[PDB]
């Protein structure tokens, strides 16, 4: 399915929250699907589901663990058509363990590598690019 992209969001990366859930930041604590290496930090790209905690936002969200999905990143990744695309910010949306988002709208664009894996996120994306 998804081809390998350049990962640029290791653990401990505070990315912006790009939905109307009330959260502003997403402190990535781990990434789904990462087996592991002796010292390698679990990194994530766009379209990867991560476990994140909110650092700034509503009190009912900033002390728990939330499954998030990265939709934008500043690390330029290469697509199969030889295009290196990067965004001006690292963004993510809070979702469930099955892909359903908690919010209803998404500010800013959403990477195509994220909209194709998560159709529930692509429906709330104002611009898929």
């Amino acid at each position: 399915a998804k081809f390998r992209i350049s990962l640029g969001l290791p653990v401990g990366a505070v990315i912006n929250c790009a939905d109307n859930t009330g959260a502003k930041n997403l402190y990535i604590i781990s990434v789904k699907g990462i087996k592991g290496r002796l010292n390698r930090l679990p990194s994530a790209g766009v379209g990867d589901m991560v476990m994140a905690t909110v650092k700034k936002g509503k009190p009912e969200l900033r002390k728990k663990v939330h499954p998030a999905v990265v939709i934008r990143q500043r690390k330029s990744y290469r697509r199969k058509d030889g295009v290196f695309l990067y965004f001006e910010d690292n963004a993510g949306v809070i979702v469930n363990n099955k892909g359903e988002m908690k919010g209803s709208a998404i500010t800013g664009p959403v990477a195509k590598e994220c909209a194709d894996l998560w159709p529930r996120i692509a429906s709330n994306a104002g611009s898929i690019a």
Partner: protein, 60 residues
């Protein structure tokens, strides 16, 4: 085949580096020189070697 958003040059499907912003505007750049000047908020119509400069000053 795209055109550079800063220099106006023609970008081929293997070169370049496109850059999408939060406001939904996607910009293609030929190389890092056009990209670095774009992020520096440089005016292409004042950069002497760009297409927008040669069109503004009617050099062609």
């Amino acid at each position: 085949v795209e055109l550079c958003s800063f220099s106006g040059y023609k970008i081929y499907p293997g070169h370049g580096r496109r850059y999408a912003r939060i406001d939904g505007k996607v910009f293609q750049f030929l190389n890092a020189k056009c990209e670095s000047a774009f992020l520096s908020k440089r005016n292409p119509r004042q950069i002497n070697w760009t297409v927008l400069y040669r069109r503004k000053h009617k050099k062609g």
